[PDB]
Design a protein around this motif. Structure first.
Motif, short mmCIF file in Angstrom:
data_model
loop_
_atom_site.label_atom_id
_atom_site.label_comp_id
_atom_site.label_asym_id
_atom_site.label_seq_id
_atom_site.Cartn_x
_atom_site.Cartn_y
_atom_site.Cartn_z
N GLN A 148 0.83 -1.20 0.00
CA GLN A 148 0.00 0.00 0.00
C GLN A 148 0.87 1.26 0.00
N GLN A 149 1.94 1.24 0.79
CA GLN A 149 2.89 2.35 0.82
C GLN A 149 3.64 2.47 -0.51
N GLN A 150 4.01 1.35 -1.11
CA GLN A 150 4.67 1.39 -2.41
C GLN A 150 3.72 1.79 -3.55
N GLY A 151 2.45 2.06 -3.22
CA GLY A 151 1.49 2.49 -4.22
C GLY A 151 0.84 1.40 -5.06
N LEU A 152 1.16 0.14 -4.79
CA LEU A 152 0.58 -0.98 -5.56
C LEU A 152 -0.83 -1.35 -5.11
N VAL A 153 -1.15 -1.03 -3.87
CA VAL A 153 -2.48 -1.31 -3.32
C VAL A 153 -3.09 -0.04 -2.75
N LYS A 154 -4.28 0.31 -3.22
CA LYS A 154 -4.91 1.54 -2.75
C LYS A 154 -5.57 1.33 -1.40
N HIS A 155 -6.37 0.28 -1.28
CA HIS A 155 -7.11 0.04 -0.05
C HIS A 155 -7.02 -1.42 0.43
N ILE A 156 -7.10 -1.60 1.74
CA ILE A 156 -6.91 -2.91 2.34
C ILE A 156 -8.20 -3.38 3.00
N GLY A 157 -8.53 -4.64 2.79
CA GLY A 157 -9.69 -5.23 3.42
C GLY A 157 -9.39 -6.60 4.00
N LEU A 158 -10.42 -7.22 4.57
CA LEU A 158 -10.28 -8.50 5.26
C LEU A 158 -11.37 -9.49 4.87
N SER A 159 -10.99 -10.76 4.80
CA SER A 159 -11.91 -11.83 4.47
C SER A 159 -11.70 -12.99 5.43
N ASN A 160 -12.80 -13.48 6.01
CA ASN A 160 -12.78 -14.63 6.93
C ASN A 160 -12.05 -14.34 8.25
N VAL A 161 -12.58 -13.40 9.03
CA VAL A 161 -11.90 -12.89 10.22
C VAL A 161 -12.82 -12.73 11.42
N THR A 162 -12.27 -13.02 12.60
CA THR A 162 -12.93 -12.80 13.88
C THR A 162 -13.02 -11.30 14.20
N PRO A 163 -13.91 -10.91 15.14
CA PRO A 163 -13.93 -9.49 15.50
C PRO A 163 -12.59 -9.02 16.06
N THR A 164 -11.93 -9.89 16.84
CA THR A 164 -10.63 -9.54 17.42
C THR A 164 -9.61 -9.26 16.32
N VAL A 166 -10.15 -8.27 13.36
CA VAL A 166 -10.52 -7.00 12.74
C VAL A 166 -9.94 -5.84 13.55
N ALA A 167 -10.11 -5.91 14.87
CA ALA A 167 -9.54 -4.91 15.76
C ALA A 167 -8.03 -4.83 15.61
N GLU A 168 -7.37 -5.99 15.62
CA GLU A 168 -5.93 -6.04 15.45
C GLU A 168 -5.55 -5.33 14.18
N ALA A 169 -6.20 -5.73 13.10
CA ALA A 169 -5.87 -5.24 11.78
C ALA A 169 -5.95 -3.72 11.68
N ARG A 170 -6.93 -3.13 12.34
CA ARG A 170 -7.19 -1.70 12.18
C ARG A 170 -6.14 -0.85 12.89
N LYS A 171 -5.34 -1.46 13.75
CA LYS A 171 -4.22 -0.76 14.39
C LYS A 171 -3.05 -0.65 13.43
N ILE A 172 -3.02 -1.53 12.43
CA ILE A 172 -1.93 -1.58 11.47
C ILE A 172 -2.22 -0.78 10.19
N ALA A 173 -3.41 -0.95 9.64
CA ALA A 173 -3.76 -0.25 8.41
C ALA A 173 -5.22 0.09 8.44
N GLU A 174 -5.66 0.94 7.52
CA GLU A 174 -7.08 1.22 7.46
C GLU A 174 -7.77 0.04 6.78
N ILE A 175 -8.91 -0.35 7.34
CA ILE A 175 -9.70 -1.45 6.79
C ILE A 175 -10.98 -0.89 6.20
N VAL A 176 -11.20 -1.10 4.90
CA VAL A 176 -12.41 -0.59 4.24
C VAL A 176 -13.54 -1.62 4.12
#
Length: 282
Positions: A148-164, A166-176
């Motif tokens: 995402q920083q190198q410009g190859l990925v505009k937005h990041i999402g998640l598939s097949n994930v627990t609520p926890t 999801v919480a973890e992930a959102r501390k690292i990158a924005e989740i759309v």
């Protein structure tokens, strides 16, 4: 109606490309001509959100999207998912090493004919079962956050994930978006849906009609028949009203089913009907 995924507005009735591939989503589709026609009809019908993956029959589904639709209008968002690869037994294997994740993002770019990916789902696979399971996704997500920083990925999402997770992930990158198992039956993610809704994060149910018991299916058909609708149309219509952040990606190799799926936006679900459907999982 619509929702803003990343920075692009999408029609909440989208298209899942998973059927445009051989059985087990492996190898070529039965008829590539029909595949091409379906994608084109989809856009003509107003689809501007297409869900795909390069591990769909690997590479072939992406290349069909490209042949059929390239060059893509400004309107179109193509969402792809990485984190898995295809064994030659058509199995679905965890592929989340830095090399694998980078290779996956790279194949997507070449096969779709793109310089940048609008939205990339990390398909999490913790443990031996076939759904959400706990475990840190930081390593995998960090690798994505860098592309995402190198410009190859505009937005990041998640598939097949627990609520926890999801919480973890959102501390690292924005989740759309979050793309999970969910439908009229299987409603375990209900609270997460509403929570994500509050934060403007999309929720994307896998399969409108997966895993219904005979009686559950029978109740849906009753309801569909009374409305002059298809059960899949009722399934979709229910998903749309359930929450404004829900985006649908029904898949089909058939123009008729595409057409009837798209018609679901018109299907009006009465409060009385809603009472029956809300009780199917109970």
């Amino acid at each position: 109606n619509t929702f803003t995924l990343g920075t692009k507005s999408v029609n909440r009735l989208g298209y899942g490309a998973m059927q445009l591939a051989g059985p087990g989503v492996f190898g070529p589709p039965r008829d590539r001509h029909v595949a091409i026609t379906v994608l084109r009809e989809a856009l003509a019908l107003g689809v501007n959100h297409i869900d795909t993956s390069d591990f769909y029959g690997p590479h072939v589904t992406n290349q069909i999207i490209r042949e059929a639709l390239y060059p893509y209008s400004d309107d179109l968002t193509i969402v792809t998912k990485i984190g898995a690869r295809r064994g030659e037994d058509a199995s679905w294997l965890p592929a989340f090493s830095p090399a694998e994740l980078q290779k996956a993002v790279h194949d997507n770019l070449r096969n779709l004919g793109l310089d940048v990916l609008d939205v990339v789902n990390l398909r999490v696979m913790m443990g031996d079962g076939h759904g959400p399971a706990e475990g840190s996704i930081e390593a995998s997500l960090t690798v994505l956050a860098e592309m995402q920083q190198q410009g190859l990925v505009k937005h990041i999402g998640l598939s097949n994930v627990t609520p926890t997770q999801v919480a973890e992930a959102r501390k690292i990158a924005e989740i759309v978006c979050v793309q999970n198992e969910y439908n009229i039956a299987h409603r375990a993610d209900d609270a997460m849906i509403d929570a994500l809704a509050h934060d403007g994060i999309a929720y994307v149910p896998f399969f409108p009609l997966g895993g219904f018991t005979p009686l559950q299916s029978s109740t849906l058909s009753d309801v569909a028949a009374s409305l002059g609708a298809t059960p899949m149309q009722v399934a979709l219509a229910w998903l749309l009203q359930r929450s404004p952040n829900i985006l649908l990606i029904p898949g089909t190799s058939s123009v008729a089913h595409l057409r009837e799926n798209m018609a679901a936006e018109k299907l009006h679900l009465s409060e009385e009907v809603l009472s029956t459907l809300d009780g199917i999982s109970r």
